[PDB]
Amino acid sequence: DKWEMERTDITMKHKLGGGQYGEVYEGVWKKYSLTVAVKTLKEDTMEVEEFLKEAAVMKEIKHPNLVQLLGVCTREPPFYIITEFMTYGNLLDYLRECNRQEVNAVVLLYMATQISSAMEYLEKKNFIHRDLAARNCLVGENHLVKVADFGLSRLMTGDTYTAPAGAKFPIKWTAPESLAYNKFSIKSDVWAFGVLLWEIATYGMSPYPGIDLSQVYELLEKDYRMERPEGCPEKVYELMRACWQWNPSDRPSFAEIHQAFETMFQESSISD
Ligand SMILES: Cn1c(=O)c(-c2c(Cl)cccc2Cl)cc2cnc(Nc3cccc(CO)c3)nc21
């Protein structure tokens, strides 16, 4: 296993995420004097075999906008998943604390384009992300954004899977078919992407402000959708609305979404 490395090849420096991502640390890959991120399996939380499968999936991921795997420690506990380290943390906190004069309109477009590229890649590689949201996107220097990939599941593109009963998902980012029947497909990620676009346009505001979680589904079925955020370009809002079509088959593919954003980003750049 060319990915396998000895636990002693890495040294832990600081704990990360405040615990919101589980047991994650900022470490050092000694040989290369390289700062890395290290995820360890939190006993009594996720099942070991599922943890190891995520590691297996990451070995197959190679895209500029998906967190890159660097190595794994799977022989014996503690199990480790080592990846590149993103300097600025998650996109949600980044947007909430940034200088909006720097992180302006073209930058928001740039970030959406990068995320859509990552999702287009997953769509082509038979993967879905179980929780696409700003909280799971990481930021690096120069507004580089990479989608975290620990939450990836193997699912043939176009197919649907049914989650266990009692499964708890982020209601405000969850597609209708998931809320009602626990059904998920790549189109469910498209719906989530629309909510993510809203998070970006509002610089990290919470979705459906003030709306009780228990009534989100009842509102969605009657065609209620979040309003266009102040400052949000019409074309981008139109894409959000397309992502939120009730019928999953009516939602655009990430290939189409990425093309749309790439075009807007180019035209916007040509207006330098
Ligand atoms: C929190 N987190 C992860 O869970 C993974 C990761 C791992 Cl270790 C294994 C598998 C999949 C992933 Cl996405 C990679 C990763 C890379 N960079 C960062 N940077 C980061 C996070 C929080 C705060 C700050 C700033 O102090 C900087 N945080 C990261």
Residue numbers in the entry: 252 to 523
Show sentences the authors wrote.
The recognition of an inactive conformation of Abl, in which a catalytically important Asp-Phe-Gly (DFG) motif is flipped by approximately 180° with respect to the active conformation, underlies the specificity of the cancer drug imatinib, which is used to treat CML.
Molecules E and G were obtained from the same crystal form of Abl and are very similar, except for the presence of either the ATP-peptide analog (molecule E) or the kinase inhibitor PD166326 (molecule G). In these structures, the kinase adopts a conformation intermediate between αC-Glu In and αC-Glu Out: while helix αC is not rotated out of the active site of the kinase, a rotation of the side chain of Glu 286 has occurred, resulting in the breakage of the Glu 286–Lys 271 salt bridge. The conformation of Abl represented by molecules E and G suggests a mechanism by which Abl can interconvert between αC-Glu In and αC-Glu Out conformations.
